Every structure is written in structure tokens, then in C-alpha cells.
Amino acid sequence: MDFLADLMDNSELIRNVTLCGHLHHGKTCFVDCLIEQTHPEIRKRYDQDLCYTDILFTEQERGVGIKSTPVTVVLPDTKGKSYLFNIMDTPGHVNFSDEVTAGLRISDGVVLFIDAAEGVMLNTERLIKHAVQERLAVTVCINKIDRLILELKLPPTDAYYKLRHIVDEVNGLISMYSTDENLILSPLLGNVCFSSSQYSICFTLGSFAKIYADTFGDINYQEFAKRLWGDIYFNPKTRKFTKKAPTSSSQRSFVEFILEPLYKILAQVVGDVDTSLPRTLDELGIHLTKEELKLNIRPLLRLVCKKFFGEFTGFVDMCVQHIPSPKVGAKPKIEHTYTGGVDSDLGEAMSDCDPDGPLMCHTTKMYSTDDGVQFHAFGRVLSGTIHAGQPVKVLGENYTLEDEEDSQICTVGRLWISVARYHIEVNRVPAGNWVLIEGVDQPIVKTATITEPRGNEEAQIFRPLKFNTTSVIKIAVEPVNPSELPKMLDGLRKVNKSYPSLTTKVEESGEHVILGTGELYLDCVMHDLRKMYSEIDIKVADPVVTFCETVVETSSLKCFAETPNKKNKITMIAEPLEKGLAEDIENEVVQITWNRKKLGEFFQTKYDWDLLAARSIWAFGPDATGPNILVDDTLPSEVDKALLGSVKDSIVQGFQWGTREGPLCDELIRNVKFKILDAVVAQEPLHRGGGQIIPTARRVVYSAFLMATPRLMEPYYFVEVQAPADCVSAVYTVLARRRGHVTQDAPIPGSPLYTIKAFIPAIDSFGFETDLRTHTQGQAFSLSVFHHWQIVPGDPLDKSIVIRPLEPQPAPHLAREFMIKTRRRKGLSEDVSISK
Template identity: 70%
Template sequence: LILHRFFGDASGFVDMLQHHVPSPIDSAASKVENIYTGLRDSSCMADMTACDPSGALMINVVKLYSAPDGVTFHAFGRIYSGTLKVGDSVKVLGEAYSLDDEEDMAVCEVTGISIGEGRYRLDVERAGAGNWVMIQGVDAPINKTATITSVRGNDDATIFRPLSFNTTAVMKLAVEPLNPAELPKMVEGLRRISKSYPATATKVEESGEHVIFGTGELSLDCIMHDLRRMYSDIEVKTADPVTAFCETVVETSALKCFAETPNKRNKLTMIAEPLEEGLAEDIERGEVSIDWDRKQLGEFFQSKYDWDLLAARSVWAFGPDIDGPNILVDDTLPSEVDKKLLKQVQESVVQGFQWGCREGPLCDEPIRNTKFKILDATIAPEPIHRGGGQIIPTARRVAYSAFLMATPRLMEPVMELQIQAPADVVSSIFPVLARRRGHVVQDTPKPGAPFYTIKAYLPAIDSFGFETDLRAFTQGQAMCFQTFDHWSIVPGDPLDRSIVLHPLEPSPPPQLARDFMVKTRRRKGLSEDVSIQKFFDDPMLMELAKQDAEMSNMM
């Protein structure tokens, strides 16, 4: 009553939303322009732009909320056009759906519609364009996000762009059930975890290990609580948390690497080299797309990164996916290579390149920040001798050999820390960071408050338990917020076999890359060392031996 007398009705927040947030009709055009992947002149695009309740049904599902039973989910989405009714049959288009490949599509029946009102939900029989609704009965085929449209009369509809996040799930946790007989329950629980947490992913390694990728320690704690208590209701064991790594190169391949197909009718020659600084991040942010025409791609690479125009227009693919941080370039000359035959096998070469980028040769981690150039190609004229079964594994193998000849290195994720602490405990923070390979980049007082704001970088693999140490050293007076910031090259050569690793002892910085690679390979059930015989053909090994002999004679 007292506050009411001084400040009036408690309607400020709602009034602010009404005044500053545009209505669905006013904002529809700009929203659809940014998130819809279909043609701009299609009929459903016109309906969504007008927010027409009598037009074609188009709903963008952005989140799945668990039902009280912990088994089903309510799909939360916005109706951009059309009207949805209980009992309607709808098409659910997944993130991998396209007009050319309709595999990721299912038909479901809407069993319930509700509108969220704070902690309550109001059940309704129908909802029109412009509403945010919770939909029941359509969650089974949805993984993260989806597009819902009508079953008939909207055949040219495509999907809304999947959500992108400004952070990356780089922390890994291996899990297994305490009772092996309950493995199916845990697998189903992991599937529900993947649905419930938008930035989380789950994966089964080749060794059979089930791995959860999370964005931080708190995220993994919440995931494990939900997995044990809500989604599987079983006891789950966990290994020590680790981080994801990436593989990269720091030099150009020492020699042109080649590989022949098993039938000896085709031969690919390739080299690898590092990408220009900032290019991988531009690809991931969507500032350049492989879907652009060759002229637009050429202008981007030529103007921003000073590429040769011919090479800039010869970009074949990004890897391991359409916004991956690696590039495949056709650098062959028409006078030396039959371009028509090479074009016939382009799709197979791209598949092999993307397969290789997905699982690198060092420890089966993704490749990053690497450009692969095709320098020469001998392709069989008969289609039967240049099928995908011949070309795809050969393209992957030659990419691996070029990668290994270009001074490969490991990359680790680095977290950005924002620490707030009183001035008298700031000096206690520096040794905590130094013990974990962290360093401070900014240290400034916070205006209007008796606090200092400290910005620091800390390798993710050394960040486990950091907040506990920080509170202990500052008597609980420091607060920390951490998020993924960038990838950094791990010091040391991962292929240096002269390094002797001592169990239960921390490795010095020059040995870290070797230490991380060996431990990652052991965890995945791989041999400790990378075998070059696995990726190099016999003629390639003979060429390497010949070069070694020439170098020895020169010395």
C-alpha cells in the first residue's frame, strides 16, 4: 500500500512493452526477412509478411518445454500466418529439411494448444497469426527447432533458420549407467536432454562412450540433475569432465600430397595451409555463405582477404558443414586437368573433404582454420570407375596426408572471465589465474561502486573448479561469470614422439599438445600415436623417403 501511494499502479513493465515492442503485424516483415529461408516471392512469404490469419499455416518452433510427466514436450513457437486448431494434422519440418530432401519431415496431429501466462497456461481451441503458443502432440520428430505448416496447399514452404548462439558447447562429460541393463533408459534420457537444452549436444563416440557437450560447469550440473531425476530416473556414473579440441595447421604442406583410388584409375593431389586470420570466424557468423554465386564469393574473398580472383571464384565448399571454418579450393589449371571430369566428381570430393574435417587425423576432433587446395587430379573417363565409393575415401585420405605435412597443431577452447571483486582482494585473483594458465587483460574500477571489474582469459580445460578456488582465495568476495570466447593453439608439437609423459604429473607447456592428444586418443580407444601408413599410399611413402634421403645428402 505504501509503495502504491508513492509510485502508483505496478504496470510499468507492461506499459514499457506496449510502448516499445512493435505489434506482430508491424514487426512481421522484418522478422520473416531475417529468419525465413524460402523464396521471397512465394505465397507463404506474402501471408507471413501480412501476418494473415486466413493464409497458409506457418509456425516457427524455437523451444521444447518438458511436460510434467518428463516424457513428452510442449513445442513453443510463434504463428506467423494462418490459424492453428486442436485436432489439425500438420507437417513438422526439421532443421535438415529442404525441398530437394524431404526426409526430415513428419505428419503429426495437434492434441492441445495453450497460451503461457506467467507460471500458468491457458488452454485454447484455436490460435491465430501473431500469437506465441504451446503446442502438444508435435514434439516427437523435433530435435531443437522446427517449422510447422499445413499438410495440404503449402508445398513450396521451407524452414525457418535454426537458432544460432553466441557461445559454443565445448565442455564434455562422459556418462554411463550404474547398472548396464539400464542403458536404453539412459539413451532415451540423453535424447530428451538434447531436446530440452538448446545449446547442448549428445554424441556416441566410436568407442561406445556416451558424451554430453555443455557450455559450462553449471550447465553440466543442471543436465546431470535432469538426467538422473527427471528424464531417466536411474543412477548415472560420470567421468572427469574434459573439453573438446580442434585440429589445425600453422604452415603450408611441405610437399604436394597425392592419393590413388583403390582401383588405381583416379588420383588426387592436394596441399593444406592456414586460413587468413578472422576468415573462420566470418564463415561461422554467416558473413559469407557458400550458397552465394561465384561472382559474389569472388568479390568477398578478393576485397576482404586479398585472394586471387580466380582462386576466390573456385571455392568448392566449407567444411565440415555449410558454415564450417575450413575451405576447399579447386586450384587446378584447365591446361593440365580435364575440368569436365573433375566437375563430375566434385560432390564426392566435397563429401570426402567434409568427412575429414569432421574427424581430424590427430585425435578424431574437428579440423579448424585450414584451407585445402586441389592442385592436380586424374579422373577416369568411365563413370563406373569414378563412383563415390572410390572418390570419397580417397579425398579424405589425401586431405589427411596434406594436413599432416603442414605442421599440425591442437587448438583448445579459451573462456572469457568477468570477475567482480572489492579492491582489497584483487591482488589475490592473479595467482589463482596464473596457476591455471590464465591471464588478466583488463582491470578497471566499476563506476559508482566499490568494485573492480577484471577481464581475463582462461583455457577451458583448466577452468574446472576455478570458481571454488576463487572464492577460497578471496573469502567469497569475488563473483565470476565465464563464457566461451575463442580457440587458441596449444603450445607444443602433438606428434613429437621424443616427449616422455609422466603419469599423475602436470606436463610443462612445451609438452601440453602431446599430453592432450595422447589422453584424448586413449579415451576414444585409439592407439597412442598417429600412424602415417594409415593415411599415406605406398607411392607417397616412397616420395617421402626419397626427400628424406635428398635432405640427408645435402647435409
């Protein structure tokens, strides 16, 4: 117990890892195995799983991980070096991908859990891509090995083939996102570990070679593990490992030495308990009491694999070798996360992970208490130590060095090291660790930086959390009793603190809309709101998706707007963007902060924009990386460039605001390029004020966008389903019924299941999972994630189209309807006022 606390001082003996993977792949069960290994009094029941990290009532009822859980435990190594591991057990459901990112930012390593039978899935690919984006070390663990034995009954050669295909597919996926060659994976490299958390099996090549060397002696387990995978064979005539098969049917080294003993032990335990199990256990040195042989097949198998394999030292050595410690892993984290960069003095100090440096925490999670009235922040300490009952300065996502408004001084109360079910109170937490900070909840909303007050004033904030996918599902939430309206708001605040991707916004009409990723995510959000935060009756509107606005044609006429001062005139035109350019802006392929000489060269090369015209780019909207581009095209001899640059900032804010609030239905604007064609700026400095230019800039943006042919854009989800080969036609029928088209239908290699990948409208995806599972009688399962915005069919400005309430409109009537009702939901006017 005390050794765990004393182990935090050494930053080299700490590993900050996050266990991420597809839904139901064994991460929680693996953490349960680690907890049982560390805790003698914690053992799973024979029938029910343990689910140590599944602490929420929702998790224990839904059976799905909802929130990331921190587990800080001391694990022995293969040699016995007791390392300190901070494991972030993240949900596997794609809808909760944000919950992974909260745990992914404060982690120096990623453990990708992959089911042996299923293989690489949707969330697995998303998580490896995202983790590579945050420049994290990636190690792979193939869980549920027994599914190749006890379920598929594959031959050991075919089990090896399936494992090799699984490992080689992740290698071909990381190459698509990581330029570094060190991100390759191979079990002989120590990158890849094998496990079956249901039966407490956990081995790498090094660990199993260590078992061999303990059994027989005089074996170099490192050298032995170097030849325990791949096309290398074993010749007992020379007792040597040869790249060529000694005999006609010589099995590979992995098959002969690793998969063969595991297959045989599992076969003996599950088939020959009464006849050959005692003999094979004497052969393996395992001694089980008479009562331990009376257990059913599954508890007996778990017990015998616990005895034979012992501790989970393979996982520990993989993580230690291939996941950097906070001391060595701080520099890329600081570069990718700290806004001031590594060149900053504070960045340089934080790169050393000094426990005696200035305090710099990075809170990414916020965990509620039992009563739900107090929240405990959770974050990684990057420099210095945090002490209990100590005044600190808590920044915010909007804080800047110029603006001390977003920073509030708060006293840190008790500090906890959090391990799943329980928390151990501590006095101080040195750098490189994970800490539950109490008393700093009030200024923190989503993500904050904690530093010391009255010192280290030149301390910026860490970058705001960047999420894998956009949240487009929108639900309006009201109280049943309006008298209880504040409580809901209070509850709303709490869920905003508890869900990283949640977005609560009050509309013009007074409807409070919550933004979520999917049906299960919003279901959990409303359960939390109703049952623990608000504790009041709540009315929920029918779910709806958010829309965007685009153009398909150049504006017919040059659209002019003049300020109320009647001295400034802006004449603009609107053009649609090229294919992929908006995605390039969104993916941060190009930034407005790039050097201007090469910024124009990008558009001159990939899109052949004129060098002078490309250099005329002002900014992107509505954000820094927003998919809308504002380009100047004024005649140099007709507008004074120096004078135009004076109001350039005001025009930029007007553009950003107008693109963030569309004219059609008060929504975002995507894939539009606004060209400024004429500027007439008042020569007097005070007659070109921002308070007049910005509304005028928004008005001219609206006019140009309206004159250009408006179109509504709806989100399309990418859905992959794993179903028996017979159920493919049923999936096709359901998707065709819900306006979705199948892009691919590929069999899963090494399993009869087929994976069907399709694109569905997001507004047509409500109940699609239920429809698919009920129609196929539960054999087909689907996971849906937002993929891309697509133009909805129909003209959205067609006034002649009549909308019938309580009828699903045809396709050409969609774009119009999707506008009008949305406007009615926003409290806007009945139709688009072009004259406004």
C-alpha cells in the same frame, strides 16, 4: 480472463517481448511484479521473493534462472489500452545463453535489464549483440534503482550521472553491431525505462510526467517527458525549461523532478517512519492503514512505492511504442528466419501475419510435464490458427522440399496459453501468438516447423537455431548398471529435447558424450537426467573440453591419394589461413553462396588473393560456414576443368567429412586451407563414383594435413569478474595459477567494484569459479564464456614425449598429452597412423 483470449485475435494489440539481461539483474523479479499487478491473490512474502517464473526445483534451490519461462498477460497502458504481452523470462546466466535464443527467435522485442549499480556486464553485451544480429527492437530497463540510493547513497546528481553513463554505454555498444540509427536509446525517446523490482518501482519519463499531470493537472505528459532528461534545467522564475542553468547550482530537470522526489520518498520511508512518514504520505496523497505502517522497512517501502507508482504502465508504453507487433514485425523476422526468404509466396503470406492464412508455427522450446514422459512443444504461430485435436504436419531441422522424410503427421491435442505457474487451455491460437502445442513432441528434437497436412506442400523450414557461443565442455556419461543402459539413452533423448545447446553423441568406443557450455549448465543437465528423466544411477566422467586441429606450415611435399579403382588421383597441399579469415567465415561475413565475381573480390581486397585464384574457391568446410577453405589450384592446361567439375561435388563432400573428422584425435579442423594441385579423373562416368572419390578425398586431406605441421587447438574462455578493489590481486593470483592472463582491470564507474577481464584455458576453468569465490571468501564472482580457439603449446606428434598418468604435464607436454588421452577416450589407436 475471457478478454485475454479475445485479445489474441487482433495481431496489432499483441507484443512479443523477451526480458534478457545479465545474471541476477531483476528480470524474474520484474515479471513477479507484473504478475502481482495482474493477479490480486498473488503477493510475495515479506522476506522471500516471489520468483513466479522460477518453476523448476533447481531454480528454487540454485537461485539462478535455468530455463526460459513464457508469461502471457494483459497489461494496461498509460492511457489504459489493455495490451496483450507475451514475455519470455530468459535466464541471465551466460552458460544458458542458448536458452535465451530459444526465446529470442519467437520474440519481436528485447527488454535489456541492466543493474543500476553494476551497469553493463558480459552477458549484457553478448545479449545486445546477439539481439541486434536477429534484427530485433531493443529497449533498455535499468532495474535496481534503489541500489543507487539505499546502497551507494549517491547524490541525486551523481545518480543521474551513473544512469547517463549506463545508457550511453549501451548506445556505444549497439553502434558496434547495428547500422540502423533508430536503435539509439534515450529515456526521453521512450527507449529507456527505470525500475526497482524489489520495491515495485517502474517509471519512464512519460509515466512520471503522467503522475505529475495527474497530481497538478493542465500538463502535457508527452511534452513534459520531452524535457525530463539531459542538460535541460528548470527555471521557476519563468517556469520554463532552459538549456542553460538559471542559477549557479541549478540541478537538471531529471534530478530536480524525478530523482529528487524518489530520493526523498525512499529516505522518509527508510529513516523517518515514525516522525515524518505520515506527513509526507499525506503530502503525496498516499493513505496507509495503521497496520500497514507496522510492517518492516522493506515491505513498507514496497507497499508505498506500489501506492505512489501504481501499475507498471511505463514498461507497457515503452514496449508498445518501440517493439513492433507481430503484424508489423513479421517481415524482418521472416527475412532473417524463413529459409525460402520473403520473396516466396508462403513468405509473402506470412509477412502479413494473417490469422486466416496457411498454418505455420515455429516451435523453439520443449517443456517437460510433471512426470517427464511427455513433452509439450512451444512456439510462435506466424500464419493461420492451430486448433486442438487437429492433424498437422511437423517438419524437422533436416527437412527440405525435396525430402519429405523428416516430416511426420501428428495430431495436435490440447493447446495451452502458458503463463509461468499455470496454463489456460484454449481451442485455437491465431497468428502472432505463443502456443504450447501438445502431441507433436515425437518428431520434434530441437526446433521444428508446424504446418497443415495435405495442403501448402511448398513449405520449407525456418532456419535452424543459431547460438551465441560454441559448446566445448564434454562429459562422458554411463549407467552404473549396464542393464539400465537404454533408460539413460531415453533420458539422454529427453535432455536433448529440453536443452537447445545440448549435444549428445555416441563415440566409437561406446562412450556417450554430452556437450555443454559450463560447469553450472552441465550440473543442471545431469540433475535433470538423474532426477526426472532417467531416474537411474549414473556415472559421470571427469569434464573435458573439445579440441580442434590446425596447421602452422605448408605441407612439405605434394600429398597424393588414388582411389581403389586405381583410375582417379588427387594431389593436394595444406596451408594455414590468415589471421581473422576463419573468424570472418564463422561470423558469416562471407558465404559460399555469394556471387562468385564479388566473392573473389573479397579475398582480393581484404587479403589480396589473386582474382583468378580467389575465383577458384570451391567450398568451405566442414560446414557451409566452417573455418576451413578448399581452394583449387590445378594447372588449367594439365587438368580438364570441365571434367574436374564433374567430381567437384564428391571432392567437396570428402573435404567436408575430412575436416569434420580430424586425423590427430578425431576432432574438428580449424584454420586450414587445402589447395588442390593435381587432379586425374577417370574419363568414364561410372569410374569416378562418389563412393570411391569421397573416401579418397578424405584420405588425401588427412595426408596433406599431417604433412603440414599439425597442432592442437584448445578453447579459451573469456572471464570477467566483479570484485572489491582489494580483491583484484587475489583474482590475478588465481588466474595466474590456472594458466590465465588478465587482459584488463577497470574500475566500475559509480561503484567501488572493479571488473577484471581475462582469458583462461577452458580445460583449466573447471573449478576456477569455485577457486575464485572461496579464495576471496565470496567477494569475487566470475562468469565464463567460450571466446576463441588457441594453439596449445607443444608438438602434438612428438612420439618421444612420455606421459605420466595422474600428473599435470608441463606446457610442452600438453599438446601431445591432450591428443593421446583423447584418442584413448575415442577408442582410437595409440598413435597417429600416418601411413593410413
